[PDB]
Short mmCIF file of C-alpha atoms and ligand atoms in Angstrom, two decimals:
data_model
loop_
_atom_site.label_atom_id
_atom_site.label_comp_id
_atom_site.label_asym_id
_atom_site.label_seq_id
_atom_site.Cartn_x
_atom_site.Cartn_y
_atom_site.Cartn_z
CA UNK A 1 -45.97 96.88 -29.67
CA UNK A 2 -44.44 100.19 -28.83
CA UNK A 3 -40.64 100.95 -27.60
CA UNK A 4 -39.82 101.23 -23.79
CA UNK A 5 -37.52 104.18 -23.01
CA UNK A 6 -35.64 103.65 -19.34
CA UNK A 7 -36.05 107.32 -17.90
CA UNK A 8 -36.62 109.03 -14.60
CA UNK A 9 -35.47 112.53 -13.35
CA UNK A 10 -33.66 110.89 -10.63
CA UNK A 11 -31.59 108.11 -12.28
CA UNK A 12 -30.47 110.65 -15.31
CA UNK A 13 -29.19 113.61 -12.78
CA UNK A 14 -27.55 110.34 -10.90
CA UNK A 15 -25.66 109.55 -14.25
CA UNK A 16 -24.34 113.11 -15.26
CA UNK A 17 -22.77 112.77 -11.95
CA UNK A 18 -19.88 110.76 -13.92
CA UNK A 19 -17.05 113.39 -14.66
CA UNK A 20 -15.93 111.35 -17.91
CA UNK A 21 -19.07 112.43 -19.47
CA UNK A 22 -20.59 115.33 -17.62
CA UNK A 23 -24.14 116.15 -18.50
CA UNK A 24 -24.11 114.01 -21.26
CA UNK A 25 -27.36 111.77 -20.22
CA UNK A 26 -29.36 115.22 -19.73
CA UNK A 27 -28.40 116.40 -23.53
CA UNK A 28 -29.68 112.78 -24.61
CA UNK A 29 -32.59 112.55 -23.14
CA UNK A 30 -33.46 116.79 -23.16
CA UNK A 31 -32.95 116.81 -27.11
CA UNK A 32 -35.05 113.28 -27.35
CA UNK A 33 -37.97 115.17 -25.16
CA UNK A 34 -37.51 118.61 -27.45
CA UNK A 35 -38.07 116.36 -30.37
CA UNK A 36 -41.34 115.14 -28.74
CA UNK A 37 -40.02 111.70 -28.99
CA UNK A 38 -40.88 110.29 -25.32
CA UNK A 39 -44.91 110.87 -25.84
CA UNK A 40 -44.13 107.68 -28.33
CA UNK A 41 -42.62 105.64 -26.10
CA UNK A 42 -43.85 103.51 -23.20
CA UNK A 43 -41.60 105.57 -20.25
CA UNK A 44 -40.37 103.06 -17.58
CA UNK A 45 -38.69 103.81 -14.70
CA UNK A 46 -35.28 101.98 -13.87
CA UNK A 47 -34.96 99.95 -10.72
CA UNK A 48 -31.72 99.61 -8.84
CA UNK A 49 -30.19 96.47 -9.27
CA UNK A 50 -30.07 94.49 -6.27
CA UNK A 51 -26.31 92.94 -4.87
CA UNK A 52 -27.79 89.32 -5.89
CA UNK A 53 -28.46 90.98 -9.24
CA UNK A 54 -24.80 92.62 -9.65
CA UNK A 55 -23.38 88.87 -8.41
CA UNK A 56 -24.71 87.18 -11.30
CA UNK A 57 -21.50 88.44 -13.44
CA UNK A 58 -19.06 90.40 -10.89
CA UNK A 59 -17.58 88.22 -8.08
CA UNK A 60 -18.55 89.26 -4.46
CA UNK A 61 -14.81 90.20 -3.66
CA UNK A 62 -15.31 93.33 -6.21
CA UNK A 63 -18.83 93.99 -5.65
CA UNK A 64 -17.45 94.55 -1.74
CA UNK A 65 -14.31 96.65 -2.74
CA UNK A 66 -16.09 98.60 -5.30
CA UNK A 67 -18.98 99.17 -2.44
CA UNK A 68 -16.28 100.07 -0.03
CA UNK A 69 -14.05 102.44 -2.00
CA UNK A 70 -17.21 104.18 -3.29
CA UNK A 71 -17.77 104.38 0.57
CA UNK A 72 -4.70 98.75 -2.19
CA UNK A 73 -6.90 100.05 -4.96
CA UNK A 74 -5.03 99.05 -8.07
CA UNK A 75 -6.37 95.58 -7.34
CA UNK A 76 -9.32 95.65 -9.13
CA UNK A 77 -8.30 97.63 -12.24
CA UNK A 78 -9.42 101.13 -9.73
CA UNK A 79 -7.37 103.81 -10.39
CA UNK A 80 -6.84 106.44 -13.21
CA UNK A 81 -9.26 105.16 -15.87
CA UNK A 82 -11.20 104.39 -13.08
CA UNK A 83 -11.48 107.30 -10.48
CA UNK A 84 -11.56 105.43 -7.02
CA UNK A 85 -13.43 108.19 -5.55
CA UNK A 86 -16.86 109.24 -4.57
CA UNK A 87 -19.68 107.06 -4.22
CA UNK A 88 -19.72 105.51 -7.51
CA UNK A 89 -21.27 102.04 -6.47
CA UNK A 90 -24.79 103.58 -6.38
CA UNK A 91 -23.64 105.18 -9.57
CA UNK A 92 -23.01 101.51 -10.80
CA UNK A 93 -25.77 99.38 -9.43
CA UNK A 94 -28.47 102.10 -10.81
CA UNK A 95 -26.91 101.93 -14.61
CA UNK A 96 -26.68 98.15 -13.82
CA UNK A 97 -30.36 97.86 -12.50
CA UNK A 98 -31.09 100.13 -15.84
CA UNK A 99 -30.27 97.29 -18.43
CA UNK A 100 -31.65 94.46 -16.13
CA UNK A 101 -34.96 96.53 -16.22
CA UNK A 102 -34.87 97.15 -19.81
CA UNK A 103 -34.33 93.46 -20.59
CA UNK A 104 -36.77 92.25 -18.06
CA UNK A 105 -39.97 94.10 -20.02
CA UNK A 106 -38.94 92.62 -23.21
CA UNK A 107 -39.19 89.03 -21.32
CA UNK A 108 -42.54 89.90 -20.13
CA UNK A 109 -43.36 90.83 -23.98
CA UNK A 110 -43.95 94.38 -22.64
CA UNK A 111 -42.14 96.02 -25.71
CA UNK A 112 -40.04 94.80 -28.84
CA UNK A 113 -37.76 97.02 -28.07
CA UNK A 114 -36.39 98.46 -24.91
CA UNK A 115 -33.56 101.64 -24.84
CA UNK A 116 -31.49 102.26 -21.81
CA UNK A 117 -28.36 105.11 -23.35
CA UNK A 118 -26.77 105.37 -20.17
CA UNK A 119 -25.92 102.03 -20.29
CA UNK A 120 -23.33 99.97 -22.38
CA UNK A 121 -20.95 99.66 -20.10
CA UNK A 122 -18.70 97.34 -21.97
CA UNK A 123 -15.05 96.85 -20.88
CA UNK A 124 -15.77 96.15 -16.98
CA UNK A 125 -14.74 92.40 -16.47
CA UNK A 126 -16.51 90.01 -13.34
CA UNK A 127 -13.56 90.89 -10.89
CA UNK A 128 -12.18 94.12 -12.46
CA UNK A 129 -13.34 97.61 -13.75
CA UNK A 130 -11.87 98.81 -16.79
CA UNK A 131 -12.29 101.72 -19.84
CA UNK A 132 -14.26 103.55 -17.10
CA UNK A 133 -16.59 100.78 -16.60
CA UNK A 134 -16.77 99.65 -13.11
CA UNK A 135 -20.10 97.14 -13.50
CA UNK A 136 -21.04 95.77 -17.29
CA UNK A 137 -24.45 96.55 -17.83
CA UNK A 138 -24.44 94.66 -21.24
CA UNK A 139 -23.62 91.38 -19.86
CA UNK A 140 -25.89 91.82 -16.78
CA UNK A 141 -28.92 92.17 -19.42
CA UNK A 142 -27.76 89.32 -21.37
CA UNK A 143 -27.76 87.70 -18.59
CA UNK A 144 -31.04 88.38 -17.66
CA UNK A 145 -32.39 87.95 -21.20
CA UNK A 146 -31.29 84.36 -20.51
CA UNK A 147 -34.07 83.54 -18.30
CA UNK A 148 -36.32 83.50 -21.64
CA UNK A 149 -34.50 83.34 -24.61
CA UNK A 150 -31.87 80.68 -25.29
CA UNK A 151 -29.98 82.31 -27.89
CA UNK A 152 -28.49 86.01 -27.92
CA UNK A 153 -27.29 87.84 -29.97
CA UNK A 154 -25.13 91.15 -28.80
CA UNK A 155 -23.81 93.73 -31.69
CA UNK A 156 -21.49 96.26 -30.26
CA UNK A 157 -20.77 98.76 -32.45
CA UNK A 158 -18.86 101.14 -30.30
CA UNK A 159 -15.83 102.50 -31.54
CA UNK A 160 -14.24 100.52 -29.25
CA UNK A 161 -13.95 96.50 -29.28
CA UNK A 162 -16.46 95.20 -26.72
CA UNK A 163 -13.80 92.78 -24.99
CA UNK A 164 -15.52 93.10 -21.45
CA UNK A 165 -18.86 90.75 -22.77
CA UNK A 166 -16.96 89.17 -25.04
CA UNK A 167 -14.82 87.43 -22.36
CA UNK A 168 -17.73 86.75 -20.08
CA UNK A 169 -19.52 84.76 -22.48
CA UNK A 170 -15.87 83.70 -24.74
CA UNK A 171 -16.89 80.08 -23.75
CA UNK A 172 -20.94 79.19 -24.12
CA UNK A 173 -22.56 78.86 -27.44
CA UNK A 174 -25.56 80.38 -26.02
CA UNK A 175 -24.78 84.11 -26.42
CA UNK A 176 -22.91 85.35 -29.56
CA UNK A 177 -20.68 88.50 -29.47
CA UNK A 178 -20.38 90.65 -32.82
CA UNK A 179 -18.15 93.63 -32.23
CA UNK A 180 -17.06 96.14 -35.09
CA UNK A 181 -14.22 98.07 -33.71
CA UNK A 182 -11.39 100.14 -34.73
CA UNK A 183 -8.14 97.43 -34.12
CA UNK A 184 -4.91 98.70 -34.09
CA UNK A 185 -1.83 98.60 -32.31
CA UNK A 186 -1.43 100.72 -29.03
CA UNK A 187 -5.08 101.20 -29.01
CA UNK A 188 -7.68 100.67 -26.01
CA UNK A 189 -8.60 97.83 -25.45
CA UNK A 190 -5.62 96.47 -27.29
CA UNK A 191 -8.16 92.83 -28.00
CA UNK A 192 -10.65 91.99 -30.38
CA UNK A 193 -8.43 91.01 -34.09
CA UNK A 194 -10.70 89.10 -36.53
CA UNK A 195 -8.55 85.66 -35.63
CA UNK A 196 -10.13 86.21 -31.71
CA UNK A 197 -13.33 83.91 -32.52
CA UNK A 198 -13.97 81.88 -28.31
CA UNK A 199 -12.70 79.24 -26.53
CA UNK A 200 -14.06 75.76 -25.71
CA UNK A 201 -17.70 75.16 -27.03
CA UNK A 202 -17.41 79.07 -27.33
CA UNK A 203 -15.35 78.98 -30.48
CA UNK A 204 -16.50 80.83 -32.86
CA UNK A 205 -19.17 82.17 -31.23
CA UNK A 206 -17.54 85.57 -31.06
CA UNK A 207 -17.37 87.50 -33.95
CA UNK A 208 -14.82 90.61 -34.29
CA UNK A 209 -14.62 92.51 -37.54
CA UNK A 210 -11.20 94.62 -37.22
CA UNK A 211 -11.33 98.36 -38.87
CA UNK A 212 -9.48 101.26 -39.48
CA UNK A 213 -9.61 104.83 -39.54
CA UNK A 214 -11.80 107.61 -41.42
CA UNK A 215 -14.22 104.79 -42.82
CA UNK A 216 -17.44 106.32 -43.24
CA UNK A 217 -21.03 105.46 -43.76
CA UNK A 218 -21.42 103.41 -47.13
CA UNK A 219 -18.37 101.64 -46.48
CA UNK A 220 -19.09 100.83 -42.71
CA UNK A 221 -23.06 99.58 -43.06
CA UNK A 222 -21.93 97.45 -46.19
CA UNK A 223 -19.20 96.03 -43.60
CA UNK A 224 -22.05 95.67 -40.93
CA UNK A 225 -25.13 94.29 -42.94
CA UNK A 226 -22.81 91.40 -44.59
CA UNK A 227 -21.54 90.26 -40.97
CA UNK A 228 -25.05 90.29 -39.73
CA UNK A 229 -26.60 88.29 -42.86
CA UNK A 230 -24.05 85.26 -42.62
CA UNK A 231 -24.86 85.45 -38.50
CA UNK A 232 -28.31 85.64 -38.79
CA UNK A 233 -28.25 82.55 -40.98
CA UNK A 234 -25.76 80.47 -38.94
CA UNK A 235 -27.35 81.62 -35.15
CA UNK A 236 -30.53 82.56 -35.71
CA UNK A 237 -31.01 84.58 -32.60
CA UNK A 238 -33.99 84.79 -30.38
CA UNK A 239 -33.24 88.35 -28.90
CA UNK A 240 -30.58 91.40 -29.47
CA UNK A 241 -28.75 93.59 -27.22
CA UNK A 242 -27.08 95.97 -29.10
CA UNK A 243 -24.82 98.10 -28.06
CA UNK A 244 -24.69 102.13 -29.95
CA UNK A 245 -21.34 103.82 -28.94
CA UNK A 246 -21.38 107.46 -30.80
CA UNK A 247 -17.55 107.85 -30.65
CA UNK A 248 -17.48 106.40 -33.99
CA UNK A 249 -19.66 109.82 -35.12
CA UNK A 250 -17.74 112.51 -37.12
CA UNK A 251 -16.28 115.38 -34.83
CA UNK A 252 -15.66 112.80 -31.73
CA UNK A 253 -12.65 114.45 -30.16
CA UNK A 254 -11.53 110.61 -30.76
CA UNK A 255 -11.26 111.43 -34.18
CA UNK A 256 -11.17 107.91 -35.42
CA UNK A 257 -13.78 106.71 -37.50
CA UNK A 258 -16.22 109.07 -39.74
CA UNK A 259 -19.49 108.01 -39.33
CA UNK A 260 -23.07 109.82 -39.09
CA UNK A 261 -25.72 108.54 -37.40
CA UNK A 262 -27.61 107.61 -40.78
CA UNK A 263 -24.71 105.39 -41.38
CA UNK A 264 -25.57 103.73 -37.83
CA UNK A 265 -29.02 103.75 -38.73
CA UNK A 266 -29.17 101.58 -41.40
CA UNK A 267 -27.09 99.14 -39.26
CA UNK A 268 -30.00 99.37 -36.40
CA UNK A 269 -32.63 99.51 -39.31
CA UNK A 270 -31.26 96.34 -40.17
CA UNK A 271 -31.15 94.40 -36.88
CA UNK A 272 -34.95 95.99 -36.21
CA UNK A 273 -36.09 94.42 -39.64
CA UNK A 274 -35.53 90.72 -37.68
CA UNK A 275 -38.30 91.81 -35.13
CA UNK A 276 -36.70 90.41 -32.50
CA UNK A 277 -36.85 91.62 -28.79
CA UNK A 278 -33.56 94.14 -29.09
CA UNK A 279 -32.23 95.70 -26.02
CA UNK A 280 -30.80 99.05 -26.99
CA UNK A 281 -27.75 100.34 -25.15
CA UNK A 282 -25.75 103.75 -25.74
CA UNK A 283 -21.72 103.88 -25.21
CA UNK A 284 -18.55 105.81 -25.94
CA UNK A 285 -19.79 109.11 -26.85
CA UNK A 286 -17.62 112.52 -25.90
CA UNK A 287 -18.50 115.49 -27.91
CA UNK A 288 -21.97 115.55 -26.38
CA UNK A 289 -24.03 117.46 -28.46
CA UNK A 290 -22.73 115.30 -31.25
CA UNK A 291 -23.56 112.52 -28.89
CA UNK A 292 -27.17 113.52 -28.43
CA UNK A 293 -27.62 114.13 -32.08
CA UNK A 294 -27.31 110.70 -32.68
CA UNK A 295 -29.26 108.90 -30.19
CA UNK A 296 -32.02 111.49 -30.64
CA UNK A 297 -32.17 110.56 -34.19
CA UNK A 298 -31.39 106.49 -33.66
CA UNK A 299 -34.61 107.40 -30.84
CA UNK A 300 -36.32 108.69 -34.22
CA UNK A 301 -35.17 105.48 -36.54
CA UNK A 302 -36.62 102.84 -33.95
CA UNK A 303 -40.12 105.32 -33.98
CA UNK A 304 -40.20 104.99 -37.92
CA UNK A 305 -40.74 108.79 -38.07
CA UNK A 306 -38.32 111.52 -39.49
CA UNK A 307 -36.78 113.75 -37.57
CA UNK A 308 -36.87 117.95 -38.17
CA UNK A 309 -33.50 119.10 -39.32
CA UNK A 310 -33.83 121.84 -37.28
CA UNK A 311 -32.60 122.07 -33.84
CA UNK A 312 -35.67 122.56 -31.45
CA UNK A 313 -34.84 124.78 -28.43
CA UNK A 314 -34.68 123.20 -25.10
CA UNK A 315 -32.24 123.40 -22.46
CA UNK A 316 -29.06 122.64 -24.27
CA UNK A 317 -29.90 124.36 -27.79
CA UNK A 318 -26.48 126.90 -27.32
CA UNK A 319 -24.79 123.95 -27.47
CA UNK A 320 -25.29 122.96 -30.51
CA UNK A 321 -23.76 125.70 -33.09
CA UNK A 322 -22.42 126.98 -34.88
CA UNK A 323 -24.99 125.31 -37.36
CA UNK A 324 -27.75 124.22 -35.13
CA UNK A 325 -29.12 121.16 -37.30
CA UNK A 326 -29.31 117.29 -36.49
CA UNK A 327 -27.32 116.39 -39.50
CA UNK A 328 -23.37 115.81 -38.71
CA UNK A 329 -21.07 115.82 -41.47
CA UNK A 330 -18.08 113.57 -41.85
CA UNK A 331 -14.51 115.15 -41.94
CA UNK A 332 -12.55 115.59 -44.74
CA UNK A 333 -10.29 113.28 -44.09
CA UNK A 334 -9.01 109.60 -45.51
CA UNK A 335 -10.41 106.28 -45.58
CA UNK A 336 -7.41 104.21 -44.21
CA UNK A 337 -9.43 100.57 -44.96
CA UNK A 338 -7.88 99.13 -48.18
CA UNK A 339 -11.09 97.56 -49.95
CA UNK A 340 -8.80 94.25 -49.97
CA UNK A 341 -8.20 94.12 -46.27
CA UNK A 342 -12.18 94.60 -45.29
CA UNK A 343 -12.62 91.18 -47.07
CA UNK A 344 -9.85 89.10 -46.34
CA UNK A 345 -11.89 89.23 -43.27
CA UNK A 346 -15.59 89.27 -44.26
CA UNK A 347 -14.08 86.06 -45.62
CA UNK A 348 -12.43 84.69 -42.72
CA UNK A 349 -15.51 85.86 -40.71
CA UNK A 350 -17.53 84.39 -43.20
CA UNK A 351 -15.80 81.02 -42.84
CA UNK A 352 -15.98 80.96 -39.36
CA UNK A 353 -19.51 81.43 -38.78
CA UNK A 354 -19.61 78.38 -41.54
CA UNK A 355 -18.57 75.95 -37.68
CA UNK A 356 -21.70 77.25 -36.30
CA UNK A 357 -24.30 74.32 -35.68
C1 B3N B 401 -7.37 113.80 -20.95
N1 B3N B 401 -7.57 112.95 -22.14
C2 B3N B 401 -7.75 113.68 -23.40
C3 B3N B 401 -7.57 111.48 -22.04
C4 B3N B 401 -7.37 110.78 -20.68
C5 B3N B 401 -7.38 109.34 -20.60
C6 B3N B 401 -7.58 108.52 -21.78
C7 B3N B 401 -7.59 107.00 -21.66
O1 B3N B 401 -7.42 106.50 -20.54
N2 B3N B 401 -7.78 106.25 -22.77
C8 B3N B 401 -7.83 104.77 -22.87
C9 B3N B 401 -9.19 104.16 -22.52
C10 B3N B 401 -10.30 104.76 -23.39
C11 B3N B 401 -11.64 104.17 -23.03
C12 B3N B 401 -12.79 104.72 -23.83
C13 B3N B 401 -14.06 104.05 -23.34
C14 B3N B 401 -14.93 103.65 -24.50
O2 B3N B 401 -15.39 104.48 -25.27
N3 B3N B 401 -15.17 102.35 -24.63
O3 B3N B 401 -15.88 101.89 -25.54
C15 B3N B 401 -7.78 109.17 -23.07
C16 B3N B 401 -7.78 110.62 -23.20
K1 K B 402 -19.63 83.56 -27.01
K1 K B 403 -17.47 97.61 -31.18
ZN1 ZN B 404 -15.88 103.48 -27.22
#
């Protein structure tokens, strides 16, 4: 009955070891335990995930060169936004073991909902690391969550569209992909217009909502609630994995959308209200304290209580001026979605979901 948080000492320092997001775990978790936050939740350790484990979704050929280089790169998408360097396997396959451990307790009804924000690891494809995802987390749960469950249902609300689980699953009816991502041309990962719906018996069993910038709270969880009512009806799913990217928060140096985590709340209010077993996954994220901010508080959302406005001090507190509060305000800046446009597509979305069984 009460939320498992994936945390140990050991597999945090091991993920601010990645220099794309330095640190950024610690913040997380240090402003979650400041807020006294972890003394309501059930505190599981992660377990690394095993090669058999990591071979469920990745073929063996990249599980050995990605074992080997963390020991021709440009093979398996290794390179630039993947730094081919240090031992980043381990790095991988504890992140990896992180979701399958989080989705395993809610199998053995140990928690309704589990949170793992290191993981949501997105982009990465079975033979081919990619947006600085060298193993997919996200998919390795769903997998997992298969065992049980015949029907899941992942939200990615990232800024960015979650192509990597979308293709893994772009063909079976059994797991549904709902992704609301800024789409526009020139723009990582390129995929993900509202026309992409599956292929095979997998059409339209992905769902991808196309945005623009500056749209902000109202205007976003309007967007979000409406997508998940007509999916709710036509999948009815037995579990959640849903996927929290904060680069979609005000002040991201991404500067693309212009949300605040109450605008994501609602969203994950939302999802919680269908008491499903949800597996909670973090993301994008790069102006850490921001970052922190809003997990902290999504931490608070999923524990019903309210979170002080007020900073607590703890390790990281001089990082979070020149205010010091939890509250993030959005930019002043333009809402580039034309009312018009947001429903020619809650309409073809609509329609589409209309072919589910
Ligand atoms: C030094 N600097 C400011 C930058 C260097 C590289 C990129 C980039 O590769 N961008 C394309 C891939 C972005 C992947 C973001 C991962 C994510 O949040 N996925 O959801 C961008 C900025
Ligand atoms: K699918
Ligand atoms: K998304
Ligand atoms: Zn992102």
């Amino acid at each position: 009955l009460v939320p498992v948080y994936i945390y140990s000492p050991e597999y945090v320092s091991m993920c601010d070891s990645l220099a794309k997001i330095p640190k950024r775990a610690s913040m997380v978790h240090s402003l979650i335990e400041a807020y006294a936050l972890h003394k309501q939740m059930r505190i599981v350790k992660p377990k690394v995930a095993s090669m058999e484990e990591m071979a469920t979704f990745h073929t063996d050929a990249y599980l050995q060169h990605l074992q080997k280089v963390s020991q021709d790169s440009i093979e398996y998408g290794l390179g630039y936004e993947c730094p081919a360097t240090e031992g980043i396997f381990d790095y991988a396959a504890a992140i990896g073991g992180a979701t399958i451990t989080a989705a395993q307790c809610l199998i053995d009804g140990m928690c309704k909902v589990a949170i793992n924000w290191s993981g949501g690891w997105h982009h990465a494809k079975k033979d081919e690391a990619s947006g600085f995802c060298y193993l997919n987390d996200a998919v390795l749960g769903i997998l997992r969550l298969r065992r049980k469950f015949e029907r899941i249902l992942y939200v990615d609300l990232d800024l960015h569209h979650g192509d990597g689980v979308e293709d893994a699953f772009s063909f079976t009816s059994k797991v549904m992909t709902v992704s609301l991502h800024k789409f526009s041309p020139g723009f990582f990962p390129g995929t993900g217009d509202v026309s992409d719906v599956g292929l095979g018996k997998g059409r339209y069993y992905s769902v991808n909502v196309p945005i623009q910038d500056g749209i902000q709270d109202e205007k976003y969880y309007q967007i979000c609630e409406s997508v998940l009512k007509e999916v709710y009806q036509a999948f009815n799913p037995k579990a959640v994995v849903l996927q929290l990217g904060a680069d979609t928060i005000a002040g991201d140096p991404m500067c693309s959308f212009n949300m605040t985590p109450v605008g994501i709340g609602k969203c994950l209010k939302y999802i919680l209200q269908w008491q499903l077993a949800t597996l909670i996954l973090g993301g994008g994220g790069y102006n850490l304290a921001n970052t922190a901010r809003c997990w902290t508080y999504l931490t608070g959302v999923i524990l019903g209580k309210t979170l002080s406005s007020e900073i607590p001090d703890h390790e990281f507190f001089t990082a979070y001026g020149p205010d010091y509060v939890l509250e993030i305000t959005p930019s002043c800046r333009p809402d580039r979605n034309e009312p018009h446009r947001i429903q020619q597509i809650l309409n073809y979305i609509k329609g589409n979901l209309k072919h589910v069984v």
